[PDB]
UniProtKB/Swiss-Prot annotation, chain A:
GO terms for molecular function: enzyme regulator activity. The gene is PSMD3. GO terms for biological process: proteasome-mediated ubiquitin-dependent protein catabolic process; regulation of protein catabolic process; ubiquitin-dependent protein catabolic process. The lineage of its organism: Eukaryota, Metazoa, Chordata, Craniata, Vertebrata. The keyword Phosphoprotein applies. Component of the 26S proteasome, a multiprotein complex involved in the ATP-dependent degradation of ubiquitinated proteins. This complex plays a key role in the maintenance of protein homeostasis by removing misfolded or damaged proteins, which could impair cellular functions, and by removing proteins whose functions are no longer required. Therefore, the proteasome participates in numerous cellular processes, including cell cycle progression, apoptosis, or DNA damage repair. The keyword Phosphoprotein applies. Component of the 19S proteasome regulatory particle complex. The 26S proteasome consists of a 20S core particle (CP) and two 19S regulatory subunits (RP). The regulatory particle is made of a lid composed of 9 subunits including PSMD3, a base containing 6 ATPases and few additional components. Interacts with UBQLN1 (via ubiquitin-like domain). Interacts with ERCC6. Belongs to the proteasome subunit S3 family. Residues 209-388 form the PCI domain. This is 26S proteasome non-ATPase regulatory subunit 3. It comes from the Eukaryota.
From Swiss-Prot, chain B:
GO terms for biological process: double-strand break repair via homologous recombination; mRNA export from nucleus; proteasome assembly; proteasome-mediated ubiquitin-dependent protein catabolic process. It is found in: Nucleus. This is 26S proteasome complex subunit SEM1. GO terms for cellular component: cytosol; integrator complex; nucleoplasm; proteasome complex; proteasome regulatory particle, lid subcomplex; protein-containing complex. Component of the 19S proteasome regulatory particle complex. The 26S proteasome consists of a 20S core particle (CP) and two 19S regulatory subunits (RP). The regulatory particle is made of a lid composed of 9 subunits including SEM1, a base containing 6 ATPases and few additional components. Belongs to the TREX-2 complex (transcription and export complex 2), composed of at least ENY2, GANP, PCID2, SEM1, and either centrin CETN2 or CETN3. Component of the homologous recombination repair (HR) complex composed of ERCC5/XPG, BRCA2, PALB2, DSS1 and RAD51. Interacts with the C-terminal of BRCA2. Keywords: Nucleus, Proteasome. Belongs to the DSS1/SEM1 family. Transmembrane segments: none annotated. It comes from the Eukaryota. The keyword Nucleus applies.
Curated annotation (Swiss-Prot), chain C:
GO terms for biological process: proteasome-mediated ubiquitin-dependent protein catabolic process. GO terms for cellular component: cytosol; extracellular region; ficolin-1-rich granule lumen; nucleoplasm; proteasome accessory complex; proteasome complex; proteasome regulatory particle; secretory granule lumen. Component of the 19S proteasome regulatory particle complex. The 26S proteasome consists of a 20S core particle (CP) and two 19S regulatory subunits (RP). The regulatory particle is made of a lid composed of 9 subunits including PSMD6, a base containing 6 ATPases and few additional components. The gene is PSMD6. Keywords: Proteasome. Transmembrane segments: none annotated. It comes from the Eukaryota. This is 26S proteasome non-ATPase regulatory subunit 6. Belongs to the proteasome subunit S10 family. Pfam families: PCI, RPN7, RPN7_PSMD6_C. Component of the 26S proteasome, a multiprotein complex involved in the ATP-dependent degradation of ubiquitinated proteins. This complex plays a key role in the maintenance of protein homeostasis by removing misfolded or damaged proteins, which could impair cellular functions, and by removing proteins whose functions are no longer required. Therefore, the proteasome participates in numerous cellular processes, including cell cycle progression, apoptosis, or DNA damage repair. Residues 183-351 form the PCI domain. It comes from Homo sapiens.
Length: 421, 36, 379
């Protein structure tokens, strides 16, 4: 009876998990029955691991021992399975169940019913549950590879979430809508929407991260590389620490490409770190090729790992690479030199003639990646004599940004010191 | 908090220099002395 | 302490493994001489399989027979001690068993036997002796995990009540491991704190130890400390009388004679490539010493004519141009070249300016951390 004993221990753990679900419910009533805001996040933060521990027989007993007011809609869950917020929480749990069970028809129907319910009820403490429902409904449609009807659905829902001055639902809907645009490769509608929507200044860390990823990708494709790099780097700094391996991988990949485009060389600690090595190795080879300026090795790497690039989505940035590869050469040359002559850039940048040198270096300056002058009366490319930047307003400005930031955190921290009674 | 499920997933602090050179500083210096 | 095994065995194996010295008649003769003398049957089999050698059955059979007989007598004596004698001799029999296992090179057998002996034993001294044997086996087979594990083990045992001879021996072991993992700062610290007390003649000769101390010190120490502790050093300068090629290398850099410094750096490179503990570090050592030399020269200049600097370094103008470009790009040096009129200006940052940049960087790190903290906990 080893199987029976294992089932017994698992069901004791299941009683523990049911107690955890009851505690989450109780927190939700602390919020809504207490009517105080928030605390739905408190009851919700354990959603991922709880989804992990979900169990079919456990939910079979749950959908018969829960729902004190048995509105008879429980029979839309019971057959497939074999309050104003707790019902949404339970429904989200059930759609999670079908999700991990790979049952994406009743999953979509039950998600639709959940959406009808949340849309009908015009609550203000239910917006967070609505946000999570939006995300998982999108994921259902994603495993079902429509991604299209969800566009209009989520887009109207975003309209509602921004009419009601909501933050969490607004951010999550904006994020999922951007994901849909990017999955269909509509980097013009995506850009227009990002331009004419304002992200909640007070938004979850996990949503800031995703928004920053998508915005950085939009700008990267749009050829605004400096802000693209800033956005991706900030997204990474915003990202979770002990999780989201895939998200970190994708942000890192795009950041490597964007930096290489700006003309820099990434940091090697990335390719070092164990959670990424296997993911980013193709970019390891690509960075070697770009740093060397070896177009032959670059072509080899493209022909050898091109499929992964077309998979993650980089395959135009990695030709804009070629361009910024010659740019990277000129940036190194102008980083360690002060008066290099053109006939000497031709060679050390692998060019043909001083005329081509003139054109390429002039364009590099125009793009503002080398910051030098040029003189063809004698043919040299003198840089800018560095001025001692402490008798200048640059320290002023830098410390101004940093002091403003510190003051802002003091403000936000002294705020949010809520006292209960 | 939430694992972003929508996204599928030496001991030496190396810092580049893994280039391809005619040895690091032996044949280079030999040829240098030879041509000087 | 005994040689379990001669790390010269590892030196010989790696020297043969290196492609340049694969066909070394002498090296091969000496390696096989040691193999036959100490009867390392599993190690010899591994050598043959790895290096694609034609086995000599006529002697390999005798070697296997000798190993089998010795192991049989050892474990028979161990059983006799178990059935007749107490722990004080059962432990010694097990120790002899493990010692023969390591001396024959059966890695798995030696590790198992030493683990069992450590489980049995209670005396601190012999616990440390077993731990040292394990560290040296780990060093022999370059198993970073095993070496580090027994390393914290040994630190714990010595902290739990130890003695200074084993402190010095552990320090030298830590230094060799630091050289392995390219932590030359700790390597220099330990080596210079235990150069006056070299007692571990099993790992390497004292000439080799002083040479390693000089090398690591030059790569990891500032000029003040180098003068105080490696040129004004009693023993570290006593042995350099017997070592003429290393004294020149050190004193070239200190006296600011630089052409001799590159000559000796090429010498040191070709030496360390052949070496087995520095082999995956010679590119880095050479590059970092080159950067140290260039920075030392330019630390007392503001516009150094490229021709003069080439003459000082005993090279040409093109070579200097190429390598300075490389190092400035890497960001190590503080110097900007001007090739039209060949002049290498030096844009070193003033004290205030450098302090500003450090404040910006470190404050940026702290700001990132606090920003994460606040954003996380406020909401």
């Amino acid at each position: 009876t080893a199987a029976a004993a294992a089932e017994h221990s698992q069901r004791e753990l299941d009683t523990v998990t049911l107690e955890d679900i009851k505690e989450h419910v109780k927190q939700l009533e602390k919020a809504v029955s207490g009517k105080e805001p928030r605390f739905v996040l408190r009851a919700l933060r354990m959603l991922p691991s709880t989804s992990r521990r979900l169990n079919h027989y456990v939910l079979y007993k749950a959908v018969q021992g829960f729902f004190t007011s048995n509105n008879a809609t429980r029979d839309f869950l019971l057959p497939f399975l074999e309050l104003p917020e707790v019902e949404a929480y339970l429904q989200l749990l059930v759609v999670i169940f079908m999700m991990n069970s790979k049952r994406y028809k009743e999953a979509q129907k039950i998600s639709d019913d959940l959406m009808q319910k949340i849309s009908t009820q015009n609550r203000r403490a239910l917006d967070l549950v609505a946000a999570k429902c939006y995300y998982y409904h999108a994921r259902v449609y994603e495993f079902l590879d429509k991604l299209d009807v969800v566009r209009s659905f989520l887009h109207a829902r975003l309209r509602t979430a921004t009419l009601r001055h909501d933050a969490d639902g607004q951010a999550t809907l904006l994020n999922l809508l951007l994901r849909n645009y990017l999955h269909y490769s509509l980097y013009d509608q995506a850009e227009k929407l990002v331009s004419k929507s304002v992200f909640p200044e007070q938004a979850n860390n996990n949503e800031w991260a995703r928004y920053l990823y998508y915005t950085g990708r939009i700008k990267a494709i749009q050829l605004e590389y400096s802000e693209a790099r800033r956005t991706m780097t900030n997204a990474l700094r915003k990202a979770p620490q002990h999780t989201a391996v895939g998200f970190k991988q994708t942000v890192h990949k795009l950041l490597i490409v964007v930096e290489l485009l700006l003309g820099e060389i990434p940091d090697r600690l990335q390719f070092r770190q164990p959670s990424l090595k296997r993911s980013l190795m193709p970019y390891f080879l690509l960075t070697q090729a770009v740093r060397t300026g070896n177009l032959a090795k670059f072509n080899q790497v493209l022909d050898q790992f091109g499929e992964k690039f077309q998979a993650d989505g980089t395959y135009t940035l990695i030709i804009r690479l070629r361009h910024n590869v010659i740019k990277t050469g000129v940036r190194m040359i102008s980083l360690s030199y002060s008066r290099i002559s053109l006939a000497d850039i031709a060679q050390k940048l692998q060019l043909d003639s001083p005329e081509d040198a003139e054109f390429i270096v002039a364009k590099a300056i125009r793009d503002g990646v080398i910051e030098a002058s040029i003189n063809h009366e004698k043919g040299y490319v003198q840089s800018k004599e560095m001025i001692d930047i402490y008798s200048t307003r640059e320290p002023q400005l830098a410390f101004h940004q940093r002091i403003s930031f510190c003051l802002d955190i003091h403000n936000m921290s002294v705020k949010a010191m809520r006292f209960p009674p | 908090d939430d694992e972003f499920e929508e996204f599928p997933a030496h001991v030496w602090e190396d810092n580049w220099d893994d280039d391809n050179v005619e040895d690091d500083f032996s044949n280079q210096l030999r040829a240098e002395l030879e041509k000087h | 302490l005994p040689k379990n095994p001669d790390l010269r065995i590892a030196q010989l194996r790696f020297l043969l493994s290196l492609p340049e010295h694969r066909g070394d008649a002498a090296v091969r003769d000496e390696l096989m001489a040691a193999v036959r003398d100490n009867n390392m049957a599993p190690y010899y089999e591994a050598l043959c399989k790895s290096l694609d050698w034609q086995i000599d059955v006529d002697l390999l059979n005798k070697m296997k027979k000798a190993n089998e007989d010795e192991l049989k007598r050892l474990d028979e004596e161990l059983e006799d001690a178990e059935k007749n004698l107490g722990e004080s001799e059962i432990r010694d029999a097990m120790m002899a068993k493990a010692e023969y296992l390591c001396r024959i090179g059966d890695k798995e057998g030696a590790l198992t036997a030493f683990r069992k002996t450590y489980d049995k034993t209670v005396a601190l001294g012999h616990r440390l002796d077993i731990v040292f044997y394990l560290l040296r086996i780990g060093l022999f087979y370059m198993d970073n995990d095993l070496i580090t594990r027994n390393t914290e083990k040994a630190k714990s045992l010595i902290e739990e009540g130890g003695d200074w001879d084993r402190r010095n021996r552990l320090k030298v072991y830590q230094g060799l491991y630091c050289v392995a993992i390219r932590d030359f700062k700790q390597a220099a610290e330990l080596f210079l704190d235990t150069v006056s007390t070299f007692t571990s003649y099993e790992l390497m000769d004292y000439k080799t130890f002083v040479t390693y101390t000089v090398y690591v010190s030059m790569i990891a120490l500032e000029r003040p400390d180098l003068r105080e502790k490696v040129i004004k050093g009693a023993e570290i300068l006593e042995v350099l009388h017997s070592l003429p090629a290393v004294r020149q290398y050190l004193f070239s850099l200190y006296e600011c004679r630089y052409s001799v410094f590159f000559q000796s750096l090429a010498v040191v490179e070709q030496e360390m490539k052949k070496d087995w503990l520095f082999a995956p570090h010679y590119r880095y050592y050479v590059r970092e010493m080159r950067i140290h030399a260039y920075s030392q020269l330019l630390e007392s200049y503001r516009s150094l004519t490229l021709g003069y600097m080439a003459e000082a370094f005993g090279v040409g103008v093109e070579f200097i141009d190429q390598e300075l470009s490389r190092f400035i790009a890497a960001g190590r040096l503080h110097c900007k070249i001007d090739k039209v009129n060949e002049i290498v200006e030096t844009n070193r940052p003033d004290s205030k300016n450098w302090q500003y940049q450090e404040t910006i960087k470190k404050g940026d790190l702290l700001l990132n951390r606090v920003q994460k903290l606040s954003r996380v906990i406020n909401m």
